[PDB]
Amino acid sequence: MVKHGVVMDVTNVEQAQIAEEAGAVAVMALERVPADIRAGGVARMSDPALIEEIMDAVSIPVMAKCRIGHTTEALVLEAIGVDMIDESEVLTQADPFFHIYKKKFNVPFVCGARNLGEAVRRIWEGAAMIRTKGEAGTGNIVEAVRHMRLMNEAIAQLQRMTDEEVYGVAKFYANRYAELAKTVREGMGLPATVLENEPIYEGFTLAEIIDGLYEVLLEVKKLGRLPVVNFAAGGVATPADAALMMQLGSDGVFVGSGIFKSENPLERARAIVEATYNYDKPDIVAEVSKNLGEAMKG
Amino acid sequence: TDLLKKGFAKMVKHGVVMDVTNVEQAQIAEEAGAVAVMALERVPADIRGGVARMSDPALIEEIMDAVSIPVMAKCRIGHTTEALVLEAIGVDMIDESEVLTQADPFFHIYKKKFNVPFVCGARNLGEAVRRIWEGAAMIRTKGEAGTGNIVEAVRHMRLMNEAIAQLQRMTDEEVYGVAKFYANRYAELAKTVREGMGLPATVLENEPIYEGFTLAEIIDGLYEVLLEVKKLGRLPVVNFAAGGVATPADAALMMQLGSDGVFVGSGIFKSENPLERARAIVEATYNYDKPDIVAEVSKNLGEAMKG
Amino acid sequence: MVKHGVVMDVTNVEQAQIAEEAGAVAVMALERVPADIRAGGVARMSDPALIEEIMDAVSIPVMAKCRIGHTTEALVLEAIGVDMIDESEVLTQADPFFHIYKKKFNVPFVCGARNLGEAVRRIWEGAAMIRTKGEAGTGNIVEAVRHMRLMNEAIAQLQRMTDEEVYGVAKFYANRYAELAKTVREGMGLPATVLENEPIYEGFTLAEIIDGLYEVLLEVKKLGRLPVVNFAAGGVATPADAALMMQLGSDGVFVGSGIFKSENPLERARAIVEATYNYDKPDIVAEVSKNLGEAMKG
Ligand SMILES: [Cl-]
Ligand SMILES: [Cl-]
Ligand SMILES: [Cl-]
Ligand SMILES: [Cl-]
Ligand SMILES: [Cl-]
Ligand SMILES: [Cl-]
Ligand SMILES: [Cl-]
Ligand SMILES: [Cl-]
Ligand SMILES: [Cl-]
């Protein structure tokens, strides 16, 4: 799994090679970048043939997207051998109630998160990497910033809590899993309530899910950060944007439309790669920003 | 004790426990056939203007020396020290009773750490389960002591029986839900104190609230007692009826409702012919399913109590 | 100041001598015990002559009551030389807005408290001893128990808080001091609000009072108990009652009506003294309880 650097979205062999040439740590194989996905009806997993061509074209890791909760799409990506699967909200959600139970898979997953509650639930489900996102395709960095701020402030507050108070937070975060059970009971003419000792997700009862989230939260509390790699995503369009996210605590960044939707892709890609690596060196970020050309509209 | 506590209780079942205020009454109770006596300075009917506390240990000892049957005594709810005193003088069983003036508004005595067995009152299943988890070796489905009106005792036994009948139709997961609801009463103090400090009246389930136990641990404890109740179809301890038993028919009625025995306070010594009355209630309790016997011992008993 | 034992209320030389004979650690000189005070219109400080006679009659410390907020009554007790002044709610309150500013006096004060908020405010004002009371004159121990329970549970919860959270509690407790200022502003046609930097009690602003309560609360947090001697009071009528309060954490007990309103005062007084000293010895409490006679009605 990738621990740092820039992950770029590519839609063909030429873009993947450019990404690898620019210094990307990995590429995200998809048929259409986020910006274009949002003209477009139902966005699904990309054709395995396209993903395999990109895999053959480069030496760095290749990732692919699958719809939220779409277990078979994920099993397919795992079968063709992608390095990491991204259960993304960029594509059209397939299961309105649950995300894939990622722990059962061998291939690692990266999941999006808007806040600590989402991150913890995603990590408990098995995510090996979190991408704190706001909204891809906009080219507006405010998205990623809002959520990284929310993520940092929540972890800072969690560190001031006793374990008992953290358990209380875990109990609050677990409630989302019982939405289906409550809706069903109501549909059967009964109160929209659930017993904490009845199975609701992958055989786990609400009480067991609470304990699972609690353990993840205790690690977050101990580390002062998420227990898995955390990249910022959505809105990164300039070298300064990438450097901003790194200063906010990100371990790396995802770039989709920002590069291939700009005037000089290869040039801008190198610059974002440089700014991410030298995020605390204003002169370098400044230099790589000179004469980059038109950025994505957004 | 553990096994010794329930051991004593099983030997009093099917009998009548009578309240006595002196050697003469205690003796009358014994010759009448009581299985045991409850020593106290004033019967519940008289208790109900001032503060009713534990009886002078000297009076209890005099009664213990006057009769060969076991002797019980009352202590105020939550009064750990009164209970410790009664245990030291050697009573056979302590009754943490609501007939006396409650001493602790938040908690009942933690009975499990005592050697002597306790009998506690209960108006419904929730109360019985909490008293039992606290250590009660015996339960008395109380009513309204001092009124001579059996309706209170009947109401609560009806509530107890119906709740147990509904509990048996539940899955273990559903029973846990009931245990969770029953445990909330223990967090009252914590919530009130938090509010007094300017914060939401809520509590964390892993913070200690009673005798070092957290809400979470209390729920598991109540859950285990409820499972026993479900398995047995009744309380896991001896359950006597108490309240307004004033006639032989009243005692027989409670037995038909499922009571293991009865407590009689004012109904005997606040009547015209104590000894005769006591004898009739004893026989009616032993032969609650014998209309002819119940009728027979009821004839020419004289005036009863009222209230 | 007294640190343990039994403080008894006496109304004459004979009772004081009995109290001293029984083993009291100190006596409370007053014209009428709490039980009788409540037939009775306005209850005030006792005649200095009666207090001086009791002082001469015994060798142990003598205390006297003064009305809440009655500074001159307190100065009088201090002038005749009482060992401790009890600003008690048993007497008719003299100042509806504030308690005496006890720090200015040389003689120590004992104040009542129903909960932690009251204890902290009283201690900040200068109290050298707190009596966690419920309601004297009733002979019903439930009063003292309720408040000792509230006191213990509040201190237990305070120990689980960070200093920042304790400051929040101090801020909440300080509000009571601004009641006068708010009432006055409203009477002048303006919003019932106050500025935290305006003087409201003894030259102290709300902000300074908050800091004062905060410091007291930090000591409570550090010690796991109040920073001054704490006796239980109100309702103690039997040796078992005294022993109960000691098991609940009290450093000692106050007894008023319980002794001289019973059948055998001297006998019952000795027994309560013994139970308080041997509160963890059931056999002794049991033995001293035998044949005590009639206790106070209540
Ligand atoms: Cl979620
Ligand atoms: Cl909780
Ligand atoms: Cl439940
Ligand atoms: Cl992080
Ligand atoms: Cl209860
Ligand atoms: Cl039963
Ligand atoms: Cl106050
Ligand atoms: Cl202000
Ligand atoms: Cl204390």
Tab-separated table of C-alpha atoms in Angstrom, chain B residues 29-233:
chain	number	residue	atom	x	y	z
B	29	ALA	CA	-47.805	-16.293	67.878
B	30	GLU	CA	-45.825	-19.448	68.636
B	31	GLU	CA	-48.710	-21.345	70.233
B	32	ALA	CA	-50.870	-20.232	67.291
B	33	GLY	CA	-48.506	-21.989	64.893
B	34	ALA	CA	-46.515	-19.154	63.322
B	35	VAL	CA	-43.351	-20.238	61.494
B	36	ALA	CA	-41.605	-17.106	62.751
B	37	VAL	CA	-42.172	-13.677	64.256
B	38	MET	CA	-41.242	-10.150	63.231
B	39	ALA	CA	-40.207	-8.179	66.308
B	40	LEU	CA	-40.946	-4.449	66.315
B	41	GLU	CA	-41.944	-1.737	68.792
B	42	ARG	CA	-45.097	-0.739	66.870
B	43	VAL	CA	-47.215	-2.533	64.244
B	44	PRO	CA	-47.586	-0.892	60.785
B	45	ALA	CA	-51.163	0.201	61.544
B	46	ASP	CA	-49.874	2.194	64.522
B	47	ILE	CA	-46.720	3.302	62.711
B	48	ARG	CA	-48.993	5.247	60.366
B	49	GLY	CA	-46.912	10.158	62.681
B	50	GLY	CA	-43.210	10.344	63.459
B	51	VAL	CA	-39.988	8.646	62.387
B	52	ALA	CA	-40.140	4.847	62.559
B	53	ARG	CA	-36.677	3.379	63.098
B	54	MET	CA	-35.106	0.052	64.052
B	55	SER	CA	-36.413	-1.387	67.337
B	56	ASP	CA	-34.301	-1.293	70.503
B	57	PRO	CA	-31.945	-4.310	70.351
B	58	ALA	CA	-32.947	-5.142	73.937
B	59	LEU	CA	-36.586	-5.591	72.936
B	60	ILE	CA	-35.564	-7.845	70.046
B	61	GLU	CA	-33.319	-9.974	72.263
B	62	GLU	CA	-36.096	-10.392	74.846
B	63	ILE	CA	-38.308	-11.721	72.068
B	64	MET	CA	-35.548	-13.984	70.761
B	65	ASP	CA	-35.257	-15.475	74.252
B	66	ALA	CA	-39.023	-15.842	74.699
B	67	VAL	CA	-39.683	-18.126	71.733
B	68	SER	CA	-38.085	-21.142	70.075
B	69	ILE	CA	-39.097	-20.201	66.526
B	70	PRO	CA	-36.969	-17.851	64.379
B	71	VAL	CA	-37.122	-14.071	64.850
B	72	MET	CA	-36.855	-11.286	62.257
B	73	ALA	CA	-36.481	-7.531	62.685
B	74	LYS	CA	-36.870	-4.476	60.490
B	75	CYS	CA	-34.357	-1.850	59.450
B	76	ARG	CA	-34.943	1.321	57.450
B	77	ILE	CA	-34.281	1.149	53.704
B	78	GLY	CA	-30.618	1.866	52.998
B	79	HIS	CA	-29.650	1.947	56.684
B	80	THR	CA	-26.534	-0.239	56.541
B	81	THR	CA	-25.689	0.406	60.200
B	82	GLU	CA	-29.076	-0.587	61.599
B	83	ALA	CA	-28.773	-3.792	59.569
B	84	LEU	CA	-25.255	-4.386	60.905
B	85	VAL	CA	-26.642	-3.997	64.420
B	86	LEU	CA	-29.429	-6.504	63.835
B	87	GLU	CA	-26.928	-8.960	62.389
B	88	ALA	CA	-24.639	-8.563	65.398
B	89	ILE	CA	-27.399	-9.317	67.907
B	90	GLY	CA	-28.193	-12.449	65.920
B	91	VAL	CA	-31.627	-12.084	64.322
B	92	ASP	CA	-32.552	-14.872	61.914
B	93	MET	CA	-33.496	-12.524	59.084
B	94	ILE	CA	-33.531	-8.793	58.420
B	95	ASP	CA	-36.431	-7.035	56.731
B	96	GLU	CA	-35.314	-3.882	54.874
B	97	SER	CA	-38.802	-2.406	54.988
B	98	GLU	CA	-40.687	0.546	53.590
B	99	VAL	CA	-43.014	0.464	56.611
B	100	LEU	CA	-40.166	2.181	58.456
B	101	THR	CA	-38.917	5.656	57.480
B	102	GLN	CA	-36.518	5.363	54.516
B	103	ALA	CA	-32.979	6.406	55.492
B	104	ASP	CA	-31.292	6.533	52.062
B	105	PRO	CA	-33.369	8.084	49.238
B	106	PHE	CA	-31.078	6.752	46.516
B	107	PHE	CA	-29.994	3.208	47.398
B	108	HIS	CA	-31.071	0.094	49.266
B	109	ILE	CA	-28.545	-1.811	51.370
B	110	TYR	CA	-26.042	-3.972	49.478
B	111	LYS	CA	-27.281	-7.195	51.074
B	112	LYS	CA	-24.826	-9.596	49.424
B	113	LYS	CA	-21.999	-8.623	51.776
B	114	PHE	CA	-24.011	-9.637	54.858
B	115	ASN	CA	-24.064	-13.101	56.445
B	116	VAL	CA	-27.661	-12.883	57.650
B	117	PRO	CA	-30.412	-13.235	55.006
B	118	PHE	CA	-32.681	-10.345	54.002
B	119	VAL	CA	-36.322	-10.118	52.993
B	120	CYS	CA	-37.254	-7.135	50.799
B	121	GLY	CA	-40.554	-5.712	49.617
B	122	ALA	CA	-41.452	-5.412	45.941
B	123	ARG	CA	-44.419	-3.873	44.126
B	124	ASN	CA	-43.558	-5.337	40.724
B	125	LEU	CA	-41.042	-7.481	38.835
B	126	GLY	CA	-38.564	-4.652	38.336
B	127	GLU	CA	-38.323	-4.032	42.072
B	128	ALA	CA	-38.060	-7.743	42.886
B	129	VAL	CA	-35.245	-8.215	40.388
B	130	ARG	CA	-33.314	-5.208	41.708
B	131	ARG	CA	-33.770	-6.313	45.347
B	132	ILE	CA	-32.731	-9.876	44.460
B	133	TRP	CA	-29.638	-8.713	42.576
B	134	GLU	CA	-28.784	-6.603	45.619
B	135	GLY	CA	-28.857	-9.790	47.698
B	136	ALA	CA	-32.390	-10.358	48.996
B	137	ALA	CA	-32.898	-14.018	49.956
B	138	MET	CA	-36.647	-13.507	50.239
B	139	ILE	CA	-39.242	-11.240	48.684
B	140	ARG	CA	-42.546	-10.055	50.073
B	141	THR	CA	-44.914	-8.718	47.441
B	142	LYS	CA	-46.035	-5.869	49.668
B	143	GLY	CA	-49.208	-3.859	49.531
B	144	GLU	CA	-50.340	-1.406	52.174
B	145	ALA	CA	-49.274	-2.377	55.678
B	146	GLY	CA	-51.646	-1.146	58.365
B	147	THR	CA	-54.800	-0.825	56.252
B	148	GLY	CA	-56.275	-4.303	56.582
B	149	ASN	CA	-57.225	-3.915	52.920
B	150	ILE	CA	-56.061	-6.926	50.894
B	151	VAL	CA	-56.430	-5.065	47.572
B	152	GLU	CA	-52.862	-3.747	47.686
B	153	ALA	CA	-51.366	-7.197	48.172
B	154	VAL	CA	-53.573	-8.527	45.365
B	155	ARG	CA	-52.652	-5.732	42.951
B	156	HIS	CA	-48.948	-6.384	43.278
B	157	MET	CA	-49.155	-10.164	43.088
B	158	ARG	CA	-51.274	-9.726	39.936
B	159	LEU	CA	-48.600	-7.426	38.493
B	160	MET	CA	-45.847	-9.853	39.483
B	161	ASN	CA	-47.555	-12.900	37.962
B	162	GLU	CA	-48.471	-11.134	34.707
B	163	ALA	CA	-44.952	-9.725	34.236
B	164	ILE	CA	-43.399	-13.157	34.783
B	165	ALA	CA	-45.889	-14.678	32.344
B	166	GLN	CA	-44.898	-12.097	29.709
B	167	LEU	CA	-41.182	-12.588	30.417
B	168	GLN	CA	-41.423	-16.311	29.578
B	169	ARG	CA	-42.635	-15.460	26.061
B	170	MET	CA	-39.511	-13.412	25.328
B	171	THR	CA	-36.245	-14.389	23.681
B	172	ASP	CA	-33.071	-13.840	25.712
B	173	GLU	CA	-32.284	-10.731	23.620
B	174	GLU	CA	-35.676	-9.279	24.557
B	175	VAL	CA	-35.084	-10.093	28.221
B	176	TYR	CA	-31.791	-8.205	28.047
B	177	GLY	CA	-33.809	-5.233	26.822
B	178	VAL	CA	-35.931	-5.476	29.971
B	179	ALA	CA	-32.851	-5.725	32.217
B	180	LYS	CA	-31.487	-2.579	30.575
B	181	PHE	CA	-34.703	-0.718	31.333
B	182	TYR	CA	-34.757	-1.961	34.943
B	183	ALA	CA	-31.199	-0.825	35.614
B	184	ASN	CA	-31.852	2.855	34.862
B	185	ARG	CA	-33.120	3.473	38.397
B	186	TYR	CA	-29.556	3.105	39.711
B	187	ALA	CA	-28.279	6.080	37.696
B	188	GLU	CA	-30.652	8.617	39.254
B	189	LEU	CA	-28.109	9.999	41.710
B	190	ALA	CA	-25.420	10.336	39.027
B	191	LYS	CA	-27.782	12.218	36.675
B	192	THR	CA	-29.057	14.575	39.398
B	193	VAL	CA	-25.505	15.409	40.462
B	194	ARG	CA	-24.361	16.045	36.887
B	195	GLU	CA	-27.278	18.419	36.362
B	196	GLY	CA	-26.383	20.195	39.598
B	197	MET	CA	-22.914	20.794	38.163
B	198	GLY	CA	-24.437	22.489	35.108
B	199	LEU	CA	-24.246	19.584	32.663
B	200	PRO	CA	-26.758	17.325	30.834
B	201	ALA	CA	-28.529	14.874	33.172
B	202	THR	CA	-26.951	11.875	31.464
B	203	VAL	CA	-24.534	9.155	32.479
B	204	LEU	CA	-21.829	7.015	30.849
B	205	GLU	CA	-22.499	3.268	31.129
B	206	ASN	CA	-18.951	2.463	32.255
B	207	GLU	CA	-18.753	4.808	35.266
B	208	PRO	CA	-19.282	3.357	38.795
B	209	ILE	CA	-22.684	4.216	40.274
B	210	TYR	CA	-23.581	1.586	42.884
B	211	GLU	CA	-21.228	-0.317	45.169
B	212	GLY	CA	-18.497	0.010	42.542
B	213	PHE	CA	-20.665	-1.513	39.787
B	214	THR	CA	-21.111	0.398	36.505
B	215	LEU	CA	-24.495	0.680	34.778
B	216	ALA	CA	-23.269	-1.846	32.203
B	217	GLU	CA	-22.345	-4.359	34.914
B	218	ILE	CA	-25.636	-3.764	36.738
B	219	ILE	CA	-27.592	-4.533	33.560
B	220	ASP	CA	-25.746	-7.851	33.164
B	221	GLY	CA	-26.521	-8.648	36.793
B	222	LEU	CA	-30.226	-7.891	36.397
B	223	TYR	CA	-30.204	-9.813	33.121
B	224	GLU	CA	-28.923	-12.936	34.876
B	225	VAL	CA	-31.653	-12.754	37.526
B	226	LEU	CA	-34.289	-12.275	34.813
B	227	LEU	CA	-33.024	-15.377	32.997
B	228	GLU	CA	-33.556	-17.338	36.226
B	229	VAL	CA	-37.062	-15.905	36.556
B	230	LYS	CA	-37.775	-16.882	32.944
B	231	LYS	CA	-36.486	-20.434	33.426
B	232	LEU	CA	-38.426	-21.013	36.656
B	233	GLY	CA	-41.636	-19.203	35.762
